[model samples]
Target: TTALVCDNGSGLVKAGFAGDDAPRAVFPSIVGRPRHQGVMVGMGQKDSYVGDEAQSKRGILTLKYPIEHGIITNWDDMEKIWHHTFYNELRVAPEEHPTLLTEAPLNPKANREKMTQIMFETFNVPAMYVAIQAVLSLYASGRTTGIVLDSGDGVTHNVPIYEGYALPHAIMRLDLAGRDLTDYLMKILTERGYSFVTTAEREIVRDIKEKLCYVALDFENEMATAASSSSLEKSYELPDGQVITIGNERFRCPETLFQPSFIGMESAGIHETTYNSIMKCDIDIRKDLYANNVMSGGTTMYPGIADRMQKEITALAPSTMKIKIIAPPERKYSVWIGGSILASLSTFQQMWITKQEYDEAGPSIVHRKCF
Candidate 1:
């Protein structure tokens, strides 16, 4: 049977066949139904839209996200996304394929059980496997033991994995992440006299951030020159065709990742989090952890972010410890890529929780098999 890999991220869902380097279907984990406009429109309601279509029709449609804060909060909407990804996007029959899924670190056992039930009862998959997002991230970088810093859309996590097993007690989480950075950018833009009248207008901020925002090695120095340097300021045209010039806000926004206190959230920066997590581990393994600092997730995509993190962590580290940061190409899909690698391994065959096993032992078997 064909095998499928699904990295069900809070911000985006990445689904594809196993053994592939990239996902075949990638979309937002959201579903929406267009609201009825004024007269002249038919009485019949329009069909629901998923992913980009749903996101694009914001004001016209009532949008709903399946996953929130790195957890699948609504299984109903999640089912719709899975259906669209497997049947519509990937053009694959879910029942006939064995699937591998990714889950967040510190996910509840009940959540895993619920997912197991959905896979076997709703989609009727022949086999399945669920892996922690951080573990898969480390595996993507070809390491079994290391500290994985995953800063994505909703949450940022510093996880320590020792020899392929994630140390649950050593996991550290923070509310500061991609969403916070985007909101900070919006705040900066607002202070500059730009008016974002509607919620939909926020997408413009996100686009500007992705296009122009970057991490600065010397923030104070950059801030001093930002206003005077014409090169640092660039123009962005909004959806309404309004042009706005972005200056120091570019580097200033991404700076929040290293200094969450800037946004009023009292939390340690990513570097401090890494140091603290490493300290929680055994002394003998601290060297391995420091040498294998892995960066993965969408937020890590900011230009010079990896370099900045390396510099920051190095400055805070002991002289005896050597620091090495590993970030693979397309860091955003590191978890998905790791799932792909695991699903394709010959040793992975016996690890899958078969449908027959589910029938005999129920959803509880997932905790026994996959974790």
Candidate 2:
């Protein structure tokens, strides 16, 4: 079927027919092929490289991870993997399908250009449209005014909802997320001499953070007691049947968001910078914006993230306004959920540029073509 819309995020790709309830396929923004195929090594698992599966073969496979830093920069490698996955396994005969692709707001010029060129050269689609993932989520969320916090793997970007789209200049970005938290957790575990250290292992620690960690709204008070080694009174189960006490240590999860230097930051943490970004926007229009600093993103899945972010963001705002942080039912899938819903709208199809506009205006006009 010809895809009517394609919404891409740092984590996943959402694509569907013009008015479909859901995407035909919801895959990770990843693609992988084989390293060397002779004898199968990993028990029952396939020897070939795979998208989400590629993470397991990191050291094993001679892989090309194009989605590094949450952007596609390696054109040749990305193209190779596309051929290996979509053309071969996925069987994407673009000649029979119109396509929609998603990009980021403030996406690098070179990358966008290359991606457009590749789509044109590779596909026989009659038309295609490119849009930002966050913007699509805005449409899907059914709210014209609210904050969109896209807290993905490596970076947390804040987009203010201006009418229906994100205010470009008002967008704020901080290099702190699940990956950073996981890295810091691993570092802490290493400093404590814990074994079973790997990227996957660290991701499990991130799972712990999502499950057990909470943002302390009154972090100062929490840290006052948390600083003492006596606070490490809780026990965490190690993989090899060992229980370790996390004394007076508040698990070291939200510290970076509040104080990135706690994990060695060249720039300030989200706390130090969010307000600056907010103030940079039009103050009059932004007066009530902070009142409802709605949280949406994967990192918001962490316990107490909303409560703590509200508390922190509230402190930065005038006391006259009430601060409220809202976490949608599925924080991790808010973008996806919103995209899913937005994809179903009949009028939503209008947001996408047609093949004629694409050919006439070229890729550079995508951002300005629609509201």
lDDT of 1 at 182: 79
Cα lDDT tens digits for candidate 1, 65-110: 7777777888888989988898889998899999999777776788
Q: Judging by TM-score against the true structure, name the best candidate.
A: 1
Could you tally the backbone clashes for each prediction?
0, 6
Candidate 2 per-residue C-alpha lDDT over 326-345 given as tens digits, one digit per residue, 9 for 90 to 100 = 67665555554465555455
TM-scores vs. true structure, each candidate:
0.93, 0.78
- 276: Cα error in model 1, Å: 0.7
Evaluate model 1: give its lDDT. Answer: 0.85
Best by lDDT: 1
Stretches off by above 4 angstroms in model 1 are 36-47, 197-199, 227-230
